[PDB]
Design a protein around this ligand. Structure first.
Ligand SMILES: COC(=O)[C@H](O[C@H]1CC[C@@H](n2cc(C)c(=O)[nH]c2=O)C1)P(=O)(O)O
Ligand SMILES: OC[C@H]1O[C@@](CO)(O[C@H]2O[C@H](CO)[C@@H](O)[C@H](O)[C@H]2O)[C@@H](O)[C@@H]1O
Ligand SMILES: [Mg+2]
Ligand SMILES: [Mg+2]
Ligand SMILES: [Mg+2]
Lengths: 555, 412
DNA sequence: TGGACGGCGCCCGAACAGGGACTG
DNA sequence: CAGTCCCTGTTCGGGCGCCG
């Protein structure tokens, strides 16, 4: 017989499909050494088994060195078995953030020893694990082996491991309601308000508990020793920080260089306030080769300078005090870039972050502020389970004007005004009623689908008129164009009548920024006016000035 | 103890796989506790990653309640059981319900826990409980009994229900009773006291069959419509007549009788918007004959039970919200306005949330169906807050629209 | 050497969806 | 009427970061 450790989780292939037959890699003997080495050591313990050719399945395998170790780590590429294996439901729903930890008097961190290998595979499934082991190049075939436990590289390994592990920890935790255990993969963070002696008792009890299930806890455990290394962070009794971030120094930048770089900077932005990736990311747009070398703009060069400088000074986050409120304050950084700090006691930050996302062809700061407030809420709800009270650089009246008037449902949760500039505003406002004594411009434009040639023009109650010819255009653009002309040729107060739905919807949403250069100029003009009233009439109803300027811009 | 009625998903369709969304701390606590007592009562039992299927779960408090209710968002499973509860074991709809002077809604969902569930089905009721700050991986479950808020539950229990009900349907021959999912709709033309009393009677009557009742009172004969209305002015400016013609022009896709020529006439020049236009004879009459058509019915609009309801909502400002329920465009089976709901003048998402529930409810009373909503809101804005305001045990289908108001058709 | 798995985050670009306006 | 075209907005996959 072989032996059975802890309750197994049933597995299957995707019905009416069969296993992993593919030939092994031309592996360099250096690895082949390290391989048969730990291979053989398995079987004594029940991890693998030899198999009669009655097992018709083969899949390649090769080790990669374990980082920060002399030791080597074993990976079986199961990709072809994964493809044909039943789908699972991942139980890892996200990552724990340090800023979410409450303050604990005493804290232990223990890694599980050979975690995937201490967990039983499924009986009926085991066969499918079949792979074949080299000896040395050209010497012999090498023996074929079937796993008795969870292989590294299957697609089911993480979910089954985490699930089993939790099932095991349930009774201890139920036995110790006041112990906090953060369980992530095989990493355990144990903490308590116990006095360091009693606490360590419990640590030992737990190590014992995990032992009953075959789960080793070596003494490669942080005991008395702040800082603890956890999830890429350093944990201190009152503070935490990211493990130091190295940013490449390269004199000539490739595309891959900027990716590593950018992603490093996004990781950094959870604590160092004010990181900006905008101009550096601009550099990756419409490039072919990840290998290709690309030059840094004086924009992306400037950005990178201040980002490195932010990193210069050591910063740290604090922990969470459920008794006190959470506060998120937001600063506008320019070019649709936003940073925020979530804190409790002024100046002691839980975490920081940025919202840079450009959403829409035309938008404004109020919308992007709303977007960031929502980004920040969900984030908060994940980590602390509650929404921060918000401190925002937008006047309370600015906001009341926007949301009441907007045609869409919009909301910000409980929040208060902070007078830190730049303040968020609305740069212009359309009148709700036509302006007495203001010239009324009827505008239209049309364009020919085939020529892509067109006209944009206007007619007015005062007799004023214009028609402008345009090239390589569209119907929409000529309508925008007609409005632009009416804005340009008119006084500080103006009534404009368009039949364009497209143009009218854009402008009514009070954009302050656009991808379209034409919209930007329109915006630019709108800001200079004292009063603009925009009205819509249907086309081709023989309405008023609308009929006349419709004629003019067809001709 | 009972015979489990088998269930299959609609042909050539697979179970729901839908990620669980973040929960606030109070909801995770409420759920962790609810699920404990549900495990120890055998209604649900823990499971593992082997089961590929998942449905979102969260919790709510009914209107004025203060007690948490578990709510599963079964919309995706129900779409894949749709066959079953319409074609085979489904429920008939009482066209008289809407005429009653009062209708009370009771939560009978607890009853469904009695019946067990086809064992081959439970794999599909899978739902994960999240942890705050991802302390723990997800604690997964699946249902051993008829789950609340599955469309299969009130159907399988229909036989049981009718039996428990039958005595009281006979004692009270004319009181209409409808069942839509976890709810029992009950209505009478009795005065308020008689009505309330008789509800209590139905309650006891439900109790000795082993069920509770944690009731909402509607009044379908109070429910009004919101016709399209043209304004009343002593003088008309050019703007006014442009705005008017635009509206009538749009209205003409509904009421074909509408005429703009005599009103268009007033607009002939190129005139300043604020300039006053007195109204010609033939325009005064055309405007009149229009006002009258907008009083009429639309020709040939009726409800077709094979087609989905669609609900559009518009935000009118100042608390007001207008809506229209329809099956085919421009043929509206009903149109309405809401004002001063909870959150008026402070929170749109709460008001919109309130409006979607009120509208859904009328559709349940009237047609026994829920509409698919077209919501005037950004997906993220809604998806961030809607659960916070959700007071109801069902969840309609929705999609999100951006439609600027070039004309105000539905509200002056 | 070139190379496996799950989770989450950012950013990008290609592909898909649908709505209004014009064109046979 | 159907079939294009603009245009705008979503969704999805792939690249990197980070965790085991
Ligand atoms: O982390 C740990 O502790 C490891 O445990 C297991 C949990 C997931 C497994 N794992 C890990 C890595 C890093 C990796 O590239 N691939 C991989 O499959 C190993 P370890 O026992 O190797 O230390
Ligand atoms: O599923 C993607 C995304 O949409 C949601 C709600 O926005 O999906 C649910 O709602 C849809 C619209 O009613 C349903 O069609 C769908 O079946 C249902 O899952 C969320 O679940 C999710 O965030
Ligand atoms: Mg380990
Ligand atoms: Mg035109
Ligand atoms: Mg779930």
């Amino acid at each position: 017989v072989p032996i059975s450790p802890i309750e197994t989780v049933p597995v299957k292939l995707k019905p009416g499909m069969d296993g992993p037959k593919v030939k092994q890699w031309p592996l360099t003997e250096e690895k082949i050494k390290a391989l048969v080495e730990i291979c053989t050591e398995m079987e004594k313990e029940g991890k693998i088994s030899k198999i009669g050719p009655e097992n018709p399945y083969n899949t390649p395998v090769f080790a990669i060195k374990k980082k920060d170790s002399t030791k080597w780590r074993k990976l079986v590429d199961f990709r072809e078995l994964n493809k044909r294996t039943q789908d699972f439901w991942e139980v890892q729903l996200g990552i724990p953030h340090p800023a979410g930890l409450k303050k604990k008097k005493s804290v232990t961190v223990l890694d599980v020893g050979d975690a995937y290998f201490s967990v039983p595979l499924d009986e009926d499934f085991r066969k499918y694990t079949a792979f074949t082991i080299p000896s040395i190049n050209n010497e012999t075939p090498g023996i074929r082996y079937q796993y008795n436990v969870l292989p590294q590289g299957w697609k089911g390994s993480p979910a089954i491991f985490q699930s089993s592990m939790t099932k095991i920890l349930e009774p201890f935790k139920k036995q110790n309601p006041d112990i906090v255990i953060y369980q992530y993969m095989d990493d355990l963070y144990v903490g308590s308000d116990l006095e360091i002696g009693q606490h360590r008792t419990k640590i030992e009890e737990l190590r014992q508990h995990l032992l009953r299930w075959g789960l080793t806890t070596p003494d490669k455990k942080h005991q008395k020793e702040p800082p603890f290394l956890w999830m890429g962070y350093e944990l201190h009794p009152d503070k935490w920080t990211v493990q130091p971030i190295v940013l490449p120094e390269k004199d000539s930048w490739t595309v891959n260089d900027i990716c590593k770089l950018v992603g490093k900077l996004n990781w950094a932005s959870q604590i160092y306030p004010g990181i900006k990736v905008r101009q550096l990311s601009k550099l990756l747009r419409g490039t072919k080769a990840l290998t290709e070398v690309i030059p840094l703009t004086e924009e992306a060069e400037l950005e990178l300078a201040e980002n490195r400088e932010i990193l210069k000074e050591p910063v740290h986050g604090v922990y969470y005090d459920p008794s006190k409120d959470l506060i998120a304050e937001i600063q506008k950084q320019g070019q649709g870039q936003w940073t925020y700090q979530i804190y409790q006691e002024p100046f002691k930050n839980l975490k920081t972050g940025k919202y840079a996302r450009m959403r829409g062809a035309h938008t404004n700061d109020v919308k992007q502020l709303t977007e960031a407030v929502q980004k920040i809420t969900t984030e908060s709800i994940v980590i602390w389970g509650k929404t921060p009270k918000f401190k925002l650089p937008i006047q309370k009246e600015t906001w009341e004007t926007w949301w009441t008037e907007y045609w869409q449902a919009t909301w910000i949760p409980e929040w208060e005004f902070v007078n830190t500039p730049p303040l968020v505003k609305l740069w212009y406002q359309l009148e709700k009623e036509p302006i007495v004594g203001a010239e009324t411009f009827y505008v239209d434009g049309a364009a020919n689908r085939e020529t892509k040639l067109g006209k944009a023009g206007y007619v007015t109650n005062k007799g004023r008129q214009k028609v402008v010819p345009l090239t390589n255009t569209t119907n929409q653009k000529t309508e925008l164009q007609a409005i632009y002309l009416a804005l340009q040729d008119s006084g500080l107060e103006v009534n404009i009548v368009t039949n364009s739905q497209y143009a009218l919807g854009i402008i009514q949403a009070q954009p302050d920024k656009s991808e379209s250069e034409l919209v930007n100029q329109i915006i630019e003009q709108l800001i200079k006016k004292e009063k603009v009233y925009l009205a819509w009439v249907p086309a081709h109803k023989g309405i008023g000035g609308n009929e006349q300027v419709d004629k003019l811009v067809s001709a | 103890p009972i015979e489990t009625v088998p269930v299959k998903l609609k042909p050539g369709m697979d179970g729901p796989k839908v990620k669980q969304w973040p929960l606030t701390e109070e909801k995770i606590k409420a759920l962790v506790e609810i699920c404990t007592e549900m495990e120890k009562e055998g209604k649900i039992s823990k499971i593992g990653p082997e089961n590929p299927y998942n449905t979102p779960v969260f919790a709510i408090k009914k209107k004025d309640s203060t007690k948490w209710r578990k709510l599963v968002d079964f919309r995706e499973l129900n779409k894949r059981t749709q066959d079953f509860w319409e074609v085979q074991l489904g429920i008939p709809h009482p066209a008289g319900l809407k005429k009653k002077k009062s209708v009370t809604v009771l939560d009978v969902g607890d009853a469904y826990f009695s019946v067990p569930l086809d064992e081959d089905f439970r794999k599909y009721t899978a739902f994960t409980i999240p942890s705050i700050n991802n302390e723990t991986p997800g604690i997964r479950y699946q249902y051993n009994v008829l789950p609340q808020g599955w469309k299969g539950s009130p159907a399988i229990f229909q036989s049981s229900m009718t039996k428990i009900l039958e005595p009281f349907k006979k004692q009270n021959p004319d009181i209409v009773i409808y069942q839509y999912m976890d709810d029992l709709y009950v209505g009478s033309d009795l005065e308020i006291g008689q009505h309330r009393t008789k509800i209590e009677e139905l309650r006891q009557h439900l109790l000795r069959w082993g069920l509770t009742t944690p009731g909402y009172e509607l009044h379908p004969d109070k429910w009004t419509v919101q016709p399209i209305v043209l304004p009343e002015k002593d003088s008309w400016t050019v703007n006014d007549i442009q705005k008017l013609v635009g509206k009538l022009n749009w209205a003409s896709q509904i009421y074909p009788g509408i005429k703009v020529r005599q009103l268009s006439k007033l607009l002939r020049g190129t005139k300043a918007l604020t300039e006053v236009i007195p109204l010609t004879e033939e325009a005064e009459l055309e405007l009149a004959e229009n006002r009258e058509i907008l009083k009429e019915p639309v020709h040939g609009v009726y409800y077709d039970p094979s087609k989905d309801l669609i609900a559009e909502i518009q935000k009118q400002g100042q608390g007001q919200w207008t809506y229209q329920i329809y099956q085919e465009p421009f043929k509206n089976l009903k149109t309405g306005k809401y004002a001063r709901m909870r959150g008026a003048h402070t929170n749109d998402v709460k008001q919109l949330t309130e409006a979607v529930q009120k509208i859904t409810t009328e559709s349940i009373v009237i047609w026994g169906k829920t509409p698919k909503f077209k919501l005037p809101i950004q997906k993220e804005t809604w998806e961030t807050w809607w659960t916070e305001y959700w007071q109801a045990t069902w969840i309609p289908e929705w999609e999100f629209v951006n439609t600027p108001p070039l004309v105000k058709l539905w509200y002056q």
